[PDB]
Design a protein around this ligand. Structure first.
Ligand SMILES: OC[C@H]1O[C@@H](O[C@H]2[C@H](O)[C@@H](O)[C@H](O)O[C@@H]2CO)[C@H](O)[C@@H](O)[C@H]1O
Length: 150
Protein backbone atom coordinates (compact mmCIF):
# COMPACT_ATOMS: atom_id res chain seq x y z
CA UNK A 1 0.00 0.00 0.00
CA UNK A 2 0.90 3.68 -0.32
CA UNK A 3 0.91 6.52 2.22
CA UNK A 4 0.38 4.10 5.10
CA UNK A 5 -0.58 5.43 8.53
CA UNK A 6 0.10 3.18 11.54
CA UNK A 7 -1.68 3.19 14.91
CA UNK A 8 -3.34 6.60 14.48
CA UNK A 9 -4.94 8.34 17.46
CA UNK A 10 -8.76 8.44 17.29
CA UNK A 11 -10.31 10.91 16.58
CA UNK A 12 -8.30 10.77 13.36
CA UNK A 13 -8.46 13.44 10.65
CA UNK A 14 -5.93 13.41 7.83
CA UNK A 15 -5.58 14.68 4.27
CA UNK A 16 -5.79 11.97 1.63
CA UNK A 17 -2.69 11.65 -0.63
CA UNK A 18 -4.51 11.46 -3.98
CA UNK A 19 -7.83 12.20 -5.65
CA UNK A 20 -10.10 9.17 -5.26
CA UNK A 21 -10.36 8.36 -8.97
CA UNK A 22 -12.33 5.23 -10.02
CA UNK A 23 -10.52 2.08 -8.91
CA UNK A 24 -8.81 3.64 -5.89
CA UNK A 25 -8.76 1.51 -2.76
CA UNK A 26 -8.87 2.66 0.86
CA UNK A 27 -7.74 -0.12 3.21
CA UNK A 28 -8.38 0.26 6.94
CA UNK A 29 -7.34 -2.44 9.41
CA UNK A 30 -8.43 -2.32 13.03
CA UNK A 31 -10.15 -3.92 16.00
CA UNK A 32 -13.47 -3.31 17.77
CA UNK A 33 -13.09 -2.42 21.48
CA UNK A 34 -15.00 -4.27 24.20
CA UNK A 35 -18.62 -3.11 24.42
CA UNK A 36 -18.11 -0.56 21.64
CA UNK A 37 -21.29 1.30 20.72
CA UNK A 38 -20.18 2.55 17.29
CA UNK A 39 -17.44 4.14 15.21
CA UNK A 40 -17.30 5.75 11.80
CA UNK A 41 -15.14 6.26 8.72
CA UNK A 42 -15.92 9.52 6.92
CA UNK A 43 -14.67 10.58 3.50
CA UNK A 44 -14.86 14.36 3.81
CA UNK A 45 -14.59 17.53 1.74
CA UNK A 46 -12.19 19.41 3.99
CA UNK A 47 -11.67 19.25 7.76
CA UNK A 48 -13.77 22.21 8.86
CA UNK A 49 -15.57 21.61 12.17
CA UNK A 50 -17.76 24.72 11.98
CA UNK A 51 -19.35 24.83 9.58
CA UNK A 52 -18.94 21.05 9.63
CA UNK A 53 -17.24 19.72 6.48
CA UNK A 54 -19.50 17.83 4.08
CA UNK A 55 -19.22 14.06 4.35
CA UNK A 56 -19.47 12.48 0.92
CA UNK A 57 -19.48 9.03 2.50
CA UNK A 58 -20.27 8.18 6.13
CA UNK A 59 -19.61 4.50 6.95
CA UNK A 60 -20.93 3.92 10.47
CA UNK A 61 -21.01 0.40 11.97
CA UNK A 62 -23.33 0.24 15.01
CA UNK A 63 -23.17 -2.65 17.48
CA UNK A 64 -26.11 -2.45 19.87
CA UNK A 65 -28.76 -5.14 19.48
CA UNK A 66 -28.48 -7.14 16.24
CA UNK A 67 -25.94 -4.66 14.91
CA UNK A 68 -25.87 -2.86 11.56
CA UNK A 69 -24.03 -0.43 9.31
CA UNK A 70 -25.52 2.98 8.59
CA UNK A 71 -24.33 4.89 5.53
CA UNK A 72 -25.21 8.49 4.75
CA UNK A 73 -24.01 11.80 3.36
CA UNK A 74 -23.74 15.16 5.13
CA UNK A 75 -24.39 18.24 2.98
CA UNK A 76 -24.34 21.76 4.47
CA UNK A 77 -24.53 20.20 7.94
CA UNK A 78 -27.61 18.13 7.16
CA UNK A 79 -27.76 14.35 6.96
CA UNK A 80 -29.56 12.90 3.97
CA UNK A 81 -31.50 9.66 3.63
CA UNK A 82 -29.88 6.81 5.56
CA UNK A 83 -28.91 3.61 3.79
CA UNK A 84 -28.80 0.78 6.28
CA UNK A 85 -27.16 -2.61 5.83
CA UNK A 86 -28.54 -5.17 8.30
CA UNK A 87 -26.06 -7.97 7.54
CA UNK A 88 -23.00 -6.62 9.38
CA UNK A 89 -19.68 -8.55 9.56
CA UNK A 90 -18.41 -6.40 12.44
CA UNK A 91 -18.33 -7.69 16.02
CA UNK A 92 -17.01 -6.46 19.36
CA UNK A 93 -13.54 -7.70 20.31
CA UNK A 94 -12.77 -8.86 16.75
CA UNK A 95 -10.27 -7.53 14.22
CA UNK A 96 -11.33 -6.30 10.79
CA UNK A 97 -10.09 -5.17 7.41
CA UNK A 98 -12.20 -2.65 5.54
CA UNK A 99 -11.62 -2.21 1.83
CA UNK A 100 -13.44 0.66 0.18
CA UNK A 101 -13.22 0.73 -3.60
CA UNK A 102 -14.10 4.01 -5.27
CA UNK A 103 -15.99 3.29 -8.48
CA UNK A 104 -17.33 5.78 -11.02
CA UNK A 105 -20.94 5.68 -9.83
CA UNK A 106 -20.55 4.41 -6.27
CA UNK A 107 -18.46 3.08 -3.40
CA UNK A 108 -18.09 -0.67 -2.95
CA UNK A 109 -17.15 -1.92 0.51
CA UNK A 110 -15.82 -5.31 1.55
CA UNK A 111 -15.04 -6.40 5.10
CA UNK A 112 -12.71 -9.29 5.87
CA UNK A 113 -12.58 -10.19 2.18
CA UNK A 114 -16.35 -10.35 1.75
CA UNK A 115 -18.57 -7.92 -0.16
CA UNK A 116 -20.63 -5.92 2.33
CA UNK A 117 -22.36 -2.99 0.64
CA UNK A 118 -22.65 -0.48 -2.19
CA UNK A 119 -23.31 3.26 -1.87
CA UNK A 120 -24.09 5.53 -4.81
CA UNK A 121 -22.28 8.86 -4.92
CA UNK A 122 -24.37 11.86 -3.84
CA UNK A 123 -21.33 14.13 -3.83
CA UNK A 124 -18.69 13.87 -6.55
CA UNK A 125 -15.83 11.81 -5.06
CA UNK A 126 -13.27 14.23 -6.52
CA UNK A 127 -14.45 16.61 -3.78
CA UNK A 128 -13.01 14.29 -1.11
CA UNK A 129 -9.58 15.21 0.27
CA UNK A 130 -9.92 14.21 3.91
CA UNK A 131 -10.37 10.96 5.83
CA UNK A 132 -11.94 10.96 9.26
CA UNK A 133 -12.28 8.15 11.79
CA UNK A 134 -14.27 8.66 14.98
CA UNK A 135 -15.94 6.61 17.70
CA UNK A 136 -15.01 3.56 19.77
CA UNK A 137 -12.52 1.80 17.50
CA UNK A 138 -8.83 0.90 17.38
CA UNK A 139 -7.14 1.50 14.03
CA UNK A 140 -3.97 -0.43 13.22
CA UNK A 141 -3.31 0.96 9.76
CA UNK A 142 -4.66 3.11 6.95
CA UNK A 143 -3.48 2.57 3.38
CA UNK A 144 -4.27 3.77 -0.14
CA UNK A 145 -3.92 2.10 -3.53
CA UNK A 146 -4.34 4.03 -6.78
CA UNK A 147 -6.14 2.67 -9.92
CA UNK A 148 -2.85 2.07 -11.77
CA UNK A 149 -1.05 0.32 -8.88
CA UNK A 150 1.12 -2.66 -9.79
O1 LIG B 1 -27.37 9.24 9.34
C1 LIG B 1 -26.11 9.27 10.01
C2 LIG B 1 -26.24 10.06 11.31
O2 LIG B 1 -27.24 9.42 12.17
C3 LIG B 1 -27.41 10.17 13.42
O3 LIG B 1 -28.40 9.54 14.25
C4 LIG B 1 -29.70 9.53 13.61
C5 LIG B 1 -30.29 8.12 13.74
O4 LIG B 1 -29.42 7.18 13.10
C6 LIG B 1 -31.66 8.10 13.06
O5 LIG B 1 -32.24 6.79 13.17
C7 LIG B 1 -32.57 9.14 13.77
O6 LIG B 1 -33.85 9.13 13.14
O7 LIG B 1 -32.00 10.47 13.67
C8 LIG B 1 -30.69 10.53 14.31
C9 LIG B 1 -30.16 11.96 14.19
O8 LIG B 1 -31.07 12.87 14.82
C10 LIG B 1 -26.08 10.20 14.21
O9 LIG B 1 -26.26 10.93 15.43
C11 LIG B 1 -25.02 10.88 13.33
O10 LIG B 1 -23.76 10.92 14.03
C12 LIG B 1 -24.86 10.08 12.02
O11 LIG B 1 -24.45 8.74 12.33
Amino acid sequence: LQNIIYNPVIPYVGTIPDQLDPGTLIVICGHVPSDADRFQVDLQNGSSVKPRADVAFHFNPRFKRAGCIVCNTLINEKWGREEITYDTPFKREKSFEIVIMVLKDKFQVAVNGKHTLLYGHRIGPEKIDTLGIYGKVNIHSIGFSGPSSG
